[PDB]
Design a protein around this ligand. Structure first.
Ligand SMILES: Nc1ncnc2c1ncn2[C@@H]1O[C@H](COP(=O)(O)OP(=O)(O)NP(=O)(O)O)[C@@H](O)[C@H]1O
Ligand SMILES: Nc1ncnc2c1ncn2[C@@H]1O[C@H](COP(=O)(O)OP(=O)(O)NP(=O)(O)O)[C@@H](O)[C@H]1O
Ligand SMILES: Nc1ncnc2c1ncn2[C@@H]1O[C@H](COP(=O)(O)OP(=O)(O)NP(=O)(O)O)[C@@H](O)[C@H]1O
Ligand SMILES: Nc1ncnc2c1ncn2[C@@H]1O[C@H](COP(=O)(O)OP(=O)(O)NP(=O)(O)O)[C@@H](O)[C@H]1O
Lengths: 769, 711
C-alpha cells in the first residue's frame, strides 16, 4: 500500500489540486507532488531515477510547468472532490513494485512505477518516463529498498535513506572543513591496522573523553582522502552515527541504515561514538547483523564506558578490537594547539602568542582535572581568545563597564543627596562615596588614549594567568616560578609552620624532588607516614604542604582508619552492587592532591591492602574498575604508635634510638612492603618555646586574616607574658596549645568581641591582658 | 503608514521606475521591484502567496522587465513623479486585504495585494495576480497573522513563526524598554566570553533562580544592540522563548523554531530560559546545537544541572555553566536604588533608602525564603503597597523605614519592636543579665555562650561556620528553653529551635534526615532550615547519634552552609546548632554534691572525649554542665511558673489573682526537684494540685474572679 509520504506526495498533488483547485485527480498531478521545488530534491526530479536512467525529466519538467497550469478553473468546493479511479486504480495498481525492492508497501517512484502505465503523457513525444526496468532499475539503482511503510520522505532526498543520518567528512575533508590532526598517525595506522582483518576490522578506542576520539576520525578520513587509506580500505569513505531521536520505538529507522549501508557496497565506514548502545532494555540492535562480519565499525570509549556492556557481552570484544588512546603529550598538544591557533584567533578575530599557547599547555595541563589539555588548552584558548577579544569587541567591556562602575554609584548617592539627613548626609558619606567614583574617575583619559583591541595577540600571562585567575586564583604562584625555586626555598618556606621536623621537611622537600625529575618512578606516590601527637603536624603539616605544593588547603584530603576496621573496600567505591565513590571521587574530584589518612596505625587489612596500590604505581584502581593516578598525589599518615616513646621525648629521647625503639612497633603494625614503599617515616618531636611561641604567634600572625584583614583593621596588642601565657597555661604537652588554639578566641576574640560589643574598641582601640 | 518592508520595495519600486526612468507608475512595474532576483529573498518569486496561491513566477519571472523596458522612456523628474492613481490606488487599494485577511498597515502582501487587478499579464492568456485567490489563500500560508508594524524584518515565513513564542528583547533594548541590569557586566563578562568559543558558546546561569537571572541577559541584548557586544556577536540577536505547549505534539515547532534560526543565518542567539529539559526530548533542540551550531543560551538552578546534566554531560560538552550569586546588600542596593524610582512610580508611590537597605538588611535575614533583592523589592513593593493602600484611603508618598520595614516585616512575621529595636548591640551587651533570665546559675554558658555567640557573630572567625554547642546537665534544666530563650532572644522565635533526637537516629537515618531525590523529600533537616534559614538546632542523645551523623554535622560544624541530599547547600551559620549528652550523670554526681565542675569536667570530657572523632568535638564553640537546682531557681522556676500563670490568665483570660505561701513554694520545692527530672515533673503539677485544685473555685466560679489563694 502507499507510503504516508506517498500520501504526502499525494497530499501535494492534491494540495495542488486543492490550492491550484484541480477538480479531479489526473495523471500529471503528482509531478509537482513529486518535485519538491525546481531542485532535484525530489528523487523524481533531476539526480532522479529519470534524468540519468533513461531521459532527462527537467525537459519533461520544463514542459509540465504548463501542464500544471493548464488545469481549468474550479469554484471553492468541488476541486479534486473525486478519488478518480481512472487515476485511483493506482490505489491498487501501485502495488507492482512496492515489495519487489524487498520492502513492505508502495512508494513515490513506486506509485509512479504504475504511473508509467497510468500517469504519463504518452504522445507523439511520449512523456512517460523511465520505461520498462529503468524506473525499477533506477528504483533499485537509486537506493532501492527505498522505503518500507509510511515513514520518511517517500523516496526522500535525491537518493533514498541514509544520507539523512549518513554523515561524511571525507567531503568536509575534500571540502577542507576538517582540522588536520597530529600524532595519532600510526595510532590511526593501528586503527588502520585494525581494518585488514577478515576476522575483525572493527576497532574500539579506549580513553579519556575530549581526547580527540572523534577528531581522530579526521586523520582517519583525512588520510583516507589522502588515499593513505590502503587498497582494501580505499573504497570506503567516512560515515558514522549522529545519534538521532527515534522520533513508538522507531529503531527500524536505525535498522534502516543497516542493510542500506550493507547494500551500499563498502563505499564508506561506520564509526560509533561512545555509548555503543546498551539500552537498559534496544539491547541487540544490529548486533547480530553487526556480528555478521561485514559492516566495518569503529568503537571509541574510555575504560568504564567500555566496561559497561561488553563486560556483559564480550561479543563486541569478540567483534572488535579495543584500542587505548593515550592522552597526547603536552607538546602533542602544543603542536596541534598551533593547528587551529590561526583559526581561533581568526575565529575570535585576534592573534596569539605561542608563549601563552605553550604556557597553558605548560600550566593548564595540571589544573583542569576533568577536561583535557588535548582540548582544554584550546578550551582555555577560546576562553583566552574571547574576553580579551571581548576587551576588543564592543569596545573593551572594561570601557563598557567603566560606564557602569560609576553608573549606580552616581545615582545611588541620589538617595543620599535627595534630602539632608542626620546619618548619611554630606558631612562624610556623600563625600565618602565620592572616593569610589574618584577612584573610577582617573582611568578614562589615560585609557581612552589607547583606542581613541590593540592587544590582539594573546598575552602570554593573563591569557593563562588572568584566565587561570578566572579559572582558579592566586596567580603569583602560578605566575612565574615553576617546579623549581619553590623547591630550594620550600623548606625555608615551610620552616614557617613548626620548626623541628626540619629534616623530615627536608626529607619531604627531598622526597618531593624524588617526586620530581622522574628519577624516582614517575609512576609512584610520594609515600609519607608520620609520627607525633595532636598538634604535631600530622595534626598540621599538610596544611602547608599543598598550600606550598598545590597552593591549597584542600588538596589535603582527610581519611580516618577508625572508620575503616573491616570492609571499607565496600565504601572505597566497591564494584557497584550503593555508590561508594568517595575515595575515587576524592581524586575524581581532585587529581593533584594530598592524601591524609588518620588512625593509620590502626589501618586494617582492607585499607592497607589498597594502600599498597596507593603505595604502588602512582595509580589507584576503583571498584567500578577505574584506575586513577596516585603519582601526582601526596599521601599523609597519622601514626601515634610510639606514643610511649613519643611521651619518652620528655627525656628528649635520642630520636633514632627511640625511632628504632618505635620502629619495631610500626615495624610490627605493618608488613615491610608497605614499609618499603614508604618514602619516609618521621616523628614529630618535642616543641621549644622558640617553636611554641612562634607557632603561637603563627596563628596570632594570621588573626587579621579576616579580621584586621578582610574586616576590622584592628590594631593588635599582645603582652609578651600573654604571648607566653599562651604557651604557659595554654600549651598542652601532648596536644599543644592547639587546644588553647580553640580556646584562643575565648581569651582573645570574645575578650575583644566584648570590647567590640562595648566599642571601647573603635578601630585600633586595643586593650589586652 | 505603509510597511517599511513594503515601503522598502515601494520606494525601490519608485526607484524601479526611476532606473529606466519610466514615465508613469503603472500596474506591471513593481512586478520587477518585488524581486531582486528569483531568490526567496524576493518572496514574490516563489515564496510569494501566488506561486503557492495561483501563478508560479518561475518562467513568469520572464515578463516583468519586458514591460518595464518597453515602457516609453522618460527623464528623471517625471520618473516616480506620479502615483498614477490607476497605480496610485494601490497605495490605498493595498488596504483592502487588511480587512478580509485581518491586517492594519499596508504590508508586502498588501502592496502586492492591491496590484491584483492589472499588475499582470492580463490577456486571453493571463499570467496575472488572482484577486482574492492567491493571498487570502496563502496569506495564511505566509504568516496567518501578518500584521505587526511597518517596522520589522521580512514579512514572509522568517523561521516560521519567529515571534510565535520568543519575544525579542533586543526590541525592547533598541526600544529601551527594560531597566538595564546592574553589576551585571561581570556576568556579561562571562557571557560574551562564554560565546565566542567555537567549542561552546553555551552559557548557563546555574543556581537558585529568582535573583533575576535572565534579567542579566538584558545588557547582553543591550550590549548586543548597544554595539557593546563584539563583531562575532553583533549580527546575532537575542530572543527569549515563550512555551506554546499544547496537543500531535507541537514540540516539532519547538524543533521548527530551530530550523528557523541557525538556518536563519544564525543571525540571533536565542535565550532559553529556566527549564532545559529531558521531558520527564532526547534530541530536541540539541541536534543543531549538537550540530556544533545554534548559538543559544539556557539557565536554571544547579538542580536541573544536578538533575539533567547528570544524565548527559554532552550538555556540559554543549554548555558552559555559570554560577549565579544573589546580590549582597549594595549588590542588591543597586537594583534597590535602581528600581526604587521604578515601582514607587509603578505602584504609584515614593521611597527612601531608609527602609530600603534595611529591608534588604532585615528581610534578607527575616525574609527567610527567596532572593532578597526580589523579596526586598517584593517587600518594598508590598511595603510600598500597604502604604499606598494606606495612602489613598495620603500624607505620604515617599516611604521611610518603619512600617515599610516593621509592619511589613511584621506583616511578614511580627514583633516589630524587636526587629525595630536592635542592631544586636544591646542584644549583645545587656543580654548578659537578659539571657540570665531563664537559668539560675550556669552563668558560665550564660556568660560564655552569649559572649561566645556574640563572638560567634561579628564574623571574627569563619564567615561561614556556625555557633556550635554540645551541652551538659539534665534535660529538664531549661537549657533547651535557654536555646529557645536565646533563639527567641536572638532570632525572636522559639521555632528557631528544631527537634531531631539522636535517639530517632539509628544508622541509616542519614536517609530520613535528608536525601538525594529518589523516598523523595525535602531534607527534613534542611526542610525546616530550607524553610527557615535562621534557626536553631538542638539535637541530643548525641551519644546515640552515630558518627555517620557527624560528617554532615561536621559540614554543619563546618563552614556554616549545608548540603541537601539532592545536594542543595544552605547556610548553617545563621542557624545555631546545639547538642547535649547525658554522659556525666555519673560525673553529675559530683555537682550533685555541687562538686567542682572543672575537676569533674576534666573527668567529664574524657567521657565525651571518648565518644568522638576529635574534629567533631573540636569544632564546638563550647560545652557546659548545667548545675542542679539551688533554691534560687525554684522560686524563680516558680516565677517562671508564676509567669506562665499570668500569661493570658490571671487577667485577660482568667483574671484571677495569685498569692503563694512559702509552702506554695516549698510544698513544691519539697517535691520540686526530681533527681533526674528536676522541676520538670513539678512544672506539670501546678496544673493539678494548684490549677486543678483551683479548678475547685474555677470549675464552679466557687470563689469569685480576681481572688488570690494558695495552699
Ligand atoms: N588531533 C586533532 N586534530 C584536530 N582537531 C582536534 C584534534 N584533537 C582534538 N581536536 C579538536 O577537539 C574538538 C573536539 O575534540 P574531540 O575530538 O571530541 O575529543 P574526543 O576525545 O573525540 N571527545 P569525543 O570524540 O566527542 O567523544 C574539535 O574541535 C577538534 O577539532
Ligand atoms: N606545624 C605546624 N604548622 C602550622 N601550624 C601549627 C603547627 N603545629 C601547630 N600549629 C598550630 O596549630 C594550628 C592548627 O592545628 P591543627 O593542625 O588543625 O590540629 P588538627 O588538624 O586537629 N590535627 P591533630 O592535632 O592531630 O588532632 C595552627 O593554626 C597553628 O596555630
Ligand atoms: N542587576 C539587576 N538590575 C535590575 N533588576 C534586576 C537585576 N537582576 C535581576 N533583576 C530583576 O530580576 C527580575 C527577574 O528577572 P529574571 O532574570 O527572570 O529572574 P530569574 O532569576 O531568572 N527568576 P526565574 O526566571 O524564575 O529563574 C526582573 O524583574 C529584573 O528587574
Ligand atoms: N534554670 C532554669 N531556667 C529555666 N527553665 C528551667 C530551669 N531549670 C529547669 N527549667 C525547666 O526545665 C524544662 C526543660 O528544661 P530543658 O532545658 O528544656 O531540658 P529539656 O531538653 O527540655 N528536657 P525535657 O523538658 O524533658 O524535654 C523547662 O520547663 C524549663 O522551664
Amino acid at each position: 500500500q502507499f507510503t504516508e509520504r506517498a500520501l504526502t506526495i499525494l497530499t501535494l498533488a492534491q494540495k495542488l489540486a486543492s490550492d491550484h483547485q484541480h477538480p479531479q485527480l489526473q495523471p500529471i498531478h503528482i509531478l509537482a507532488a513529486f518535485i519538491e521545488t525546481p531542485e532535484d530534491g525530489s528523487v523524481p526530479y533531476l539526480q532522479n531515477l529519470i534524468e540519468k536512467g533513461r531521459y532527462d525529466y527537467d525537459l519533461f519538467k520544463k514542459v509540465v510547468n504548463r501542464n500544471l497550469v493548464r488545469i481549468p478553473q474550479q469554484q471553492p468546493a468541488p476541486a479534486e472532490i473525486t478519488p478518480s479511479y481512472a487515476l485511483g486504480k493506482v490505489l491498487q495498481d501501485a502495488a507492482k513494485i512496492q515489495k519487489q525492492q524487498k520492502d513492505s508497501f508502495i512508494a513515490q517512484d513506486h506509485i509512479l512505477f504504475a504511473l508509467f502505465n497510468d500517469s504519463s503523457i504518452q504522445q507523439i513525444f511520449k512523456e512517460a518516463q523511465v520505461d520498462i526496468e529503468a524506473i525499477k532499475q533506477q528504483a533499485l539503482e537509486l537506493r532501492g529498498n527505498t522505503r518500507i511503510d509510511s515513514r520518511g520522505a517517500d523516496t526522500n532526498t535525491p537518493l533514498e535513506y541514509l544520507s539523512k543520518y549518513a554523515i561524511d567528512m571525507t567531503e568536509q575533508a575534500r571540502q577542507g572543513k576538517l582540522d588536520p590532526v597530529i600524532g595519532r598517525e600510526e595510532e590511526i595506522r593501528s586503527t588502520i591496522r585494525v581494518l585488514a582483518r577478515r576476522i575483525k576490522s572493527n576497532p574500539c578506542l579506549i580513553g579519556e573523553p575530549g581526547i580527540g576520539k572523534t577528531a581522530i576520525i579526521e586523520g582517519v578520513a583525512q588520510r583516507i582522502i589522502d588515499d593513505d587509506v590502503p587498497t582494501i580500505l580505499q573504497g570506503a569513505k567516512l560515515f558514522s552515527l549522529d545519534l538521532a531521536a527515534l522520533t513508538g520505538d522507531f529503531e527500524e529507522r536505525f535498522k534502516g541504515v543497516l542493510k542500506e549501508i550493507e547494500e551500499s557496497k563498502t563505499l564508506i565506514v561506520l564509526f560509533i561514538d561512545e555509548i555503543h548502545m546498551l539500552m537498559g532494555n534496544a539491547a541487540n540492535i544490529l548486533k547480530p547483523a553487526l556480528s555478521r562480519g561485514q559492516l566495518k565499525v569503529i568503537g571509541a570509549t574510555t575504560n568504564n564506558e567500555y566496561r559497561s556492556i561488553v563486560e556483559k557481552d564480550g561479543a563486541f570484544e569478540r567483534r572488535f578490537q579495543k584500542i587505548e588512546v593515550a592522552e597526547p603529550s603536552v607538546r602533542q598538544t602544543v603542536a596541534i594547539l598551533r593547528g587551529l591557533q590561526p583559526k581561533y584567533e581568526i575565529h575570535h578575530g585576534v592573534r596569539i602568542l605561542d608563549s601563552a599557547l605553550v604556557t597553558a599547555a605548560q600550566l593548564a595541563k595540571r589544573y583542569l582535572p576533568y577536561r583535557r589539555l588535548p582540548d582544554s588548552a584550546l578550551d582555555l584558548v577560546d576562553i583566552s581568545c574571547a574576553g580579551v577579544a571581548v576587551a576588543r569587541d564592543s569596545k573593551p567591556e572594561e570601557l563598557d563597564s567603566k560606564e557602569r562602575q560609576l553608573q549606580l554609584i552616581q545615582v545611588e548617592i541620589k538617595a543620599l543627596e535627595r534630602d539632608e539627613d542626620a546619618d548619611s548626609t554630606t558631612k562624610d558619606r556623600l563625600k565618602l562615596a565620592r572616593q569610589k567614583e574618584a577612584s573610577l574617575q582617573e582611568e578614562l583619559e589615560p585609557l581612552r588614549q589607547r583606542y581613541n583591541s590593540m592587544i590582539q595577540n594573546v598575552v602570554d600571562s593573563d591569557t593563562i594567568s588572568e584566565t587561570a585567575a578566572r579559572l582558579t586564583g592566586i596567580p603569583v604562584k602560578k605566575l612565574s616560578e615553576s617546579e623549581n625555586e619553590k623547591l630550594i626555598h620550600m623548606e625555608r618556606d615551610l620552616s614557617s609552620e613548626v620548626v623541628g621536623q626540619m629534616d623530615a621537611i627536608k626529607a619531604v622537600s627531598n622526597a618531593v624532588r624524588l617526586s620530581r625529575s622522574g628519577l624516582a618512578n614517575p609512576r609512584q606516590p610520594a609515600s609519607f607516614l608520620f609520627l607525633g601527637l595532636s598538634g604535631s603536624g600530622k595534626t598540621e603539616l599538610a596544611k602547608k604542604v599543598a598550600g606550598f605544593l598545590f597552593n591549597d588547603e584542600d588538596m589535603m584530603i582527610r581519611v580516618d582508619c577508625s572508620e575503616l576496621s573491616e570492609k571499607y573496600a565496600v565504601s572505597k567505591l566497591l564494584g557497584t552492587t550503593d555508590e561508594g565513590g568517595f575515595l575515587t571521587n576524592q581524586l575524581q574530584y581532585k587529581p593533584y592532591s594530598v592524601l591524609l589518612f588518620d588512625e593509620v596505625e590502626k589501618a586494617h587489612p582492607d585499607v592497607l591492602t589498597v594502600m599498597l596500590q596507593m603505595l604502588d604505581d602512582g595509580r589507584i584502581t576503583s571498584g567500578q574498575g577505574k584506575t586513577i593516578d596516585c603519582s601526582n598525589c601526596i599521601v599523609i599518615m597519622t601514626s601515634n604508635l610510639g606514643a610511649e616513646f613519643i611521651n619518652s621525648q620528655q627525656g628528649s629521647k635520642i630520636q633514632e634510638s627511640t625511632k628504632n625503639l618505635v620502629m619495631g612497633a610500626v615495624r610490627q603494625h605493618f608488613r615491610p612492603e608497605f614499609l618499603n614503599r614508604i618514602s619516609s617515616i618521621v616523628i614529630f618531636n618535642k616543641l621549644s618555646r622558640k617553636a611554641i611561641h612562634k607557632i603561637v604567634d603563627i596563628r596570632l600572625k594570621e588573626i587579621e586574616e579576616r579580621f584586621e584583614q578582610n574586616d576590622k583593621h584592628y590594631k593588635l596588642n599582645l603582652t609578651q607574658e600573654a604571648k607566653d601565657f599562651l604557651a604557659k597555661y595554654g600549651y598542652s604537652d601532648d596536644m599543644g596549645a592547639r587546644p588553647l588554639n580553640r580556646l584562643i578566641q575565648n581569651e582573645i576574640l570574645n575578650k575583644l568581641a566584648l570590647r567590640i560589643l562595648k566599642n571601647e574598641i573603635k578601630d585600633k582601640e586595643t586593650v589586652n591582658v
